[PDB]
Design an enzyme around this catalytic site. Sequence first.
Site, short mmCIF file in Angstrom:
data_model
loop_
_atom_site.label_atom_id
_atom_site.label_comp_id
_atom_site.label_asym_id
_atom_site.label_seq_id
_atom_site.Cartn_x
_atom_site.Cartn_y
_atom_site.Cartn_z
N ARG A 110 0.82 -1.21 0.00
CA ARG A 110 0.00 0.00 0.00
C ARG A 110 0.85 1.26 0.00
O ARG A 110 0.52 2.25 -0.65
CB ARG A 110 -0.99 -0.07 1.19
CG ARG A 110 -2.10 1.00 0.89
CD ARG A 110 -3.03 1.15 2.06
NE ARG A 110 -4.29 1.76 1.57
CZ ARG A 110 -4.95 2.72 2.23
NH1 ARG A 110 -4.50 3.29 3.33
NH2 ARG A 110 -6.08 3.12 1.68
N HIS A 144 0.42 4.19 -2.63
CA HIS A 144 0.02 5.58 -2.30
C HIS A 144 1.08 6.62 -2.60
O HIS A 144 0.76 7.76 -2.90
CB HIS A 144 -0.35 5.68 -0.82
CG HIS A 144 -1.79 5.26 -0.62
ND1 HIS A 144 -2.57 5.68 0.44
CD2 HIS A 144 -2.60 4.50 -1.42
CE1 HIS A 144 -3.77 5.19 0.31
NE2 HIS A 144 -3.83 4.44 -0.78
N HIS A 159 -5.94 -6.16 -3.25
CA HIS A 159 -6.78 -6.29 -2.07
C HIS A 159 -6.91 -7.75 -1.62
O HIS A 159 -7.55 -7.96 -0.60
CB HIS A 159 -8.15 -5.62 -2.32
CG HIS A 159 -8.03 -4.15 -2.20
ND1 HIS A 159 -9.09 -3.31 -2.51
CD2 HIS A 159 -7.05 -3.30 -1.76
CE1 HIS A 159 -8.74 -2.05 -2.27
NE2 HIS A 159 -7.50 -1.98 -1.82
N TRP A 213 -10.27 -8.90 3.06
CA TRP A 213 -10.97 -9.26 1.84
C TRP A 213 -10.95 -10.80 1.67
O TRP A 213 -11.70 -11.34 0.83
CB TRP A 213 -10.27 -8.67 0.62
CG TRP A 213 -10.31 -7.16 0.55
CD1 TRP A 213 -11.29 -6.47 -0.11
CD2 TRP A 213 -9.43 -6.18 1.10
NE1 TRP A 213 -11.10 -5.12 -0.02
CE2 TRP A 213 -9.93 -4.90 0.73
CE3 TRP A 213 -8.24 -6.24 1.84
CZ2 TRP A 213 -9.33 -3.71 1.07
CZ3 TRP A 213 -7.65 -5.05 2.18
CH2 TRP A 213 -8.16 -3.79 1.81
#
Length: 291
Positions: A45, A49, A172, A188
Amino acid sequence: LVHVASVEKGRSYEDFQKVYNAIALKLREDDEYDNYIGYGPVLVRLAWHTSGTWDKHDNTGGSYGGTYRFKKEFNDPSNAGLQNGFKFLEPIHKEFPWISSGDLFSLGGVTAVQEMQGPKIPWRCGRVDTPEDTTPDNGRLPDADKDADYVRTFFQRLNMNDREVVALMGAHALGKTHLKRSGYEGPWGAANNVFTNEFYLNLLNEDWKLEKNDANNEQWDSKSGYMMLPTXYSLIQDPKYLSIVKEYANDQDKFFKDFSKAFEKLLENGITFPKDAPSPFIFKTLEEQGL
Ligand code: HEM
């Protein structure tokens, strides 16, 4: 601006394999983090980002400048929790002070995907740190409460098409949402720290119910104890996305190949690689090296 990749002086593949190895060894060692998920997901992540602020219209944001190290960006509400990935990388940077911050953040994500048994992701060096006033404002990362049309439009800014979006979202499979970070709670899937196509299988195969979580936000929940964000669930509401979800649920190799291409593209958006730059590096995993 134009951002020309500039190789860290005198460094070559073996130098970056050493950085890769130090990340991978720490990933193995610091196993307890986030109830034993480990740091792989948060490092993926962080790589996304720090790259996903890019705007193709004017080449602002993006992975090149390593600007997450500045307070405006690390305090972005969209980045809540990524401080854990930065903290992980701090001893790596201390050991290898010659790598740029953008190279480190993007390499962290490549290393995490590969060590979690994902596809090989070719990676190029040469991001150069840029000054604090080049840090993109907050608000360039996507909202989770929206629909398929929002997702499609959002990702045009990052020059991603429908296949690239659906492939990227398969990350995810990793990690989970944390209520105090994003207003969403739950994983998830079950294999939280192994990179597979499970996100797509769960989308298609679980029985989802639209519920409110304890932050008063809607999310889709299954009796297995999994969740999908509204933006994840949009991939089966939109007929174009649904076809690609079904493709990746039925072809692990194709998902791996497409994810690898899209993730490298994401990490390289905004960067001009000179014609005589090194070729992309493909790092060996610890397991391949017998480490
Ligand atoms: C429409 C696009 C997307 C939205 C709205 C979205 C939103 C979110 C949200 C809300 C979380 C939970 C943060 C938390 O509470 O800890 C999250 C986690 C995560 N995202 Fe996404 N995301 C998107 C795309 C991506 C893509 C493109 C990647 C990477 C290729 C990615 C990788 C991850 C990972 C690995 C996690 C787990 C982090 C952890 O376990 O700490 N996401 N995302």
